[PDB]
Amino acid sequence: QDGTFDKLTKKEALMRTRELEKLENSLGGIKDMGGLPDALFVIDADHEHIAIKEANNLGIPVFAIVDTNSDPDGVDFVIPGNDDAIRAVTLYLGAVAATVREGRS
Amino acid sequence: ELQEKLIAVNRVSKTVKGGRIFSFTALTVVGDGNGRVGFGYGKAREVPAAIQKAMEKARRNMINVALNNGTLQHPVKGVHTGSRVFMQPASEGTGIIAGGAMRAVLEVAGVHNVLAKAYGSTNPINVVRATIDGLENMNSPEMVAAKRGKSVEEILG
């Protein structure tokens, strides 16, 4: 973001900014956190089934928007509802954002 | 404090085009002596790193068991994959009279009086898994009272 983006090798400087942006999305908003989370709000139980199995290895209460094809056993606070329509996801994301704003008093 | 306890090391192998490579597996167990106990398997290419990696997962694998005064609650079975451990509480049985790999897991759990004997293939890692599920389903009268009858007294007199 400032400094060695030119200093030694221009092609290899394009390697690092090819390294950067793939790491930018995979490790997105996790770098601001540090340490383990306290809860975990999932929007699809079936698709992200690794994390629910991963979070239940530790002591993390999770929050899954579940569709009818998945299995609601590892999730603690199960939420039934559609999750493949875009307008459906903005309900749950808009609710979980505005409520946690009220919770950060 | 944690009172760690080793049971058995082993020399396992696997082969490649160059030859065969050994390693070591070492089943251990840890336990507080007052109702917490946990085992962990662990395996590595050298016995100091094998037993240390065994304990490090045994710390996270601890389970709570509810007992009375150094002995069990009731008789309880223990079946797991060719290892039928029997456990009888034996109120002041004057020592833990059990076989190998049960004498470890019962001691660090904190009991001192149980009579026990393993029926079947006396294999060490499969028999310490046999006592654990046999101990974690064994229930105190408190849990029995608060699901059934709803008096702590009359359920055992």
Next chain:
Amino acid sequence: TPEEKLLRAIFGEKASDVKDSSLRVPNGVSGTVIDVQVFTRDGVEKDKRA
């Protein structure tokens, strides 16, 4: 120091390690300078006061 040997840079001469120092005189007596004589060995440049 680099700055002492940098006498040559701004000016010239050589280095400044040499102790620069003007022969100053001691104390104990006041006075009023009434007469100054200057004698010059022949060949030496007479300065402006001589």
Next chain:
Amino acid sequence: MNKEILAVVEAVSNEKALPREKIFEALESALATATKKKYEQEIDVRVQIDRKSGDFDTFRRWLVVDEVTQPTKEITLEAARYEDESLNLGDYVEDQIESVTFDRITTQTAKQVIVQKVREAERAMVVDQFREHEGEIITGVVKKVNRDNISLDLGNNAEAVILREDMLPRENFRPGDRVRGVLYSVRPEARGAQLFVTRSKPEMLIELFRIEVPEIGEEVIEIKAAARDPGSRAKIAVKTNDKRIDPVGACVGMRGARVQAVSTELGGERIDIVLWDDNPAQFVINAMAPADVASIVVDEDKHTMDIAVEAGNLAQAIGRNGQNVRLASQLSGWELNVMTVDDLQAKHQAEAHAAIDTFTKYLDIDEDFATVLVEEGFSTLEELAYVPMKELLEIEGLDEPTVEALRERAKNALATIAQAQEESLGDNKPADDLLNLEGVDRDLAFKLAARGVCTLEDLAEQGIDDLADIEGLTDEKAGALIMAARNICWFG
């Protein structure tokens, strides 16, 4: 000569990682100051060093200003533009002046200014790079021990200070000893010690635990609070989000090895490690360790907690000189009152009796009904006056008319109490009525009201003789106030 300037600039730029430009600006200022000292008159001087040759030109600088206060160093914009039309306010007009010969005097001045520039560049960037150290446990060598402070050498011409309050009470350092401490403040005393180091504050304990406990450095365990009596005893509260990790066991380590390493560095300070709880009562129980707590009563309004202990545990709960309760109170943020179970019951009975007496006296209710109000949790007239009507209607035997009457009586009792005190002293009633007479300060109004002169009418009825004993009231001032009161009451 020429190439030597470039070689010096390159050597200093590479060794001190400093911009060549900043070194030249400072040499120019150094040479200007050395030039100013050769003239008997206060002149302004600019020096310019050529960046390729190392040659330098010296001026008689004339700070272009709007209004000239110093004719020897300042020139008007109109006069500056007569010489060069391109000049603006804040520029310099020059004058061909003989550059000072670079003797060992200028050389010494240049060396001093370079050293000072390096302190504000190389050393400043070193402190910026050591952002962790500025906050973590820096290590220094004791250079000097004074009565009131210890000077530490950190290397690279950085000096730190430990103040007497920042030391442990039993520490004795000698010149040459190595000392660790937290850098808790960076000020701007470049010449001397800008760095302030502590060994006594709680941050020293937190950072020692961060170094000794990897799980704290990895953010797996968090220290939520630390309370400390330096060189005697501390308490730390620890939390983890990982249910597989015991945070207390991790901080203690195998047979206490980790906590003993921290204790040894703190001169044998006793460290208690407690589990942080999000429930305040459970957290205070944990903070009171090693004393067993029998019951807790929480007063949220006073931000206080009454802690009952068994009579055998009372001395342990208080600790030596109250050290255990004080450290628990500092760790929780709550005021902690430690008493026996019998004393807590006696306190609650005395409070219940005082509430019953208050309600019987002010609400005109019987003792039986006052007892029911206290058993339902009402202790003050304010609670009865302001609590939601639904909570008062949940009490067995209260109807909506009786609750309304009880609230009206509680409000009237609160109003009467306030008015009575305001008339007795000078809070509001005498601070307006008796203080109406021009000249009455609040103190004099309360002195008048202490004699039963509570209103402006009461003051209008007085003689000078009735007020003559009031400290600060002269007969003339008494006469003026009585006449002012009479003018308002009898002639308004």
Next chain:
RNA sequence: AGAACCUUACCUGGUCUUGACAUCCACGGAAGUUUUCAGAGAUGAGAAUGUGCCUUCGGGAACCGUGAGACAGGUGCUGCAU
């Protein structure tokens, strides 16, 4: 990455044993050099000459031999002890 002898460890024969190679001990002689016979040579018997260095010179050790036991020697075996 070089066997006429040498190398060379192999063979016949002639030889010497605290030894050709190191440390140690006690004695005697500077060390060295020249030359002759006997001998296949190894060696044996000599015959001449030299007689230097530090000095406590009752010296010591650079150096040649003779006796002492420690020991020295081994291209002897086992690469499946290394």
Next chain:
RNA sequence: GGCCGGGAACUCAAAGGAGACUGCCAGUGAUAAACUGGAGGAAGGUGGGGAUGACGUCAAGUCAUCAUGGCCCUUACGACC
């Protein structure tokens, strides 16, 4: 006869640098890696060659380079011709 003066461009000697990276164009392909061709260039897709030999294999070779654990000979399996 560079044989003599002379000369320092050139050959060469020898130091130190430039240059080749898929950098450019086209095309295909997942707009990815890349691949095929063209340009320029002394040199074009790791330019040509060398040195460099992962964990291990074969208890492969050598105790006769040397060193080395053992065991054996000691007027002898040592030493001289």
Next chain:
RNA sequence: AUGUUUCUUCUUUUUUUUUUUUUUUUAUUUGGUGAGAGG
């Protein structure tokens, strides 16, 4: 198209053991002789 065969004989096993610092030498101008003088 189909292609037989590979002396003999055979192992052991991993929870108690340990290493090292001392280095080397360290205000400045003014002595005699001869004469005079003060106490």
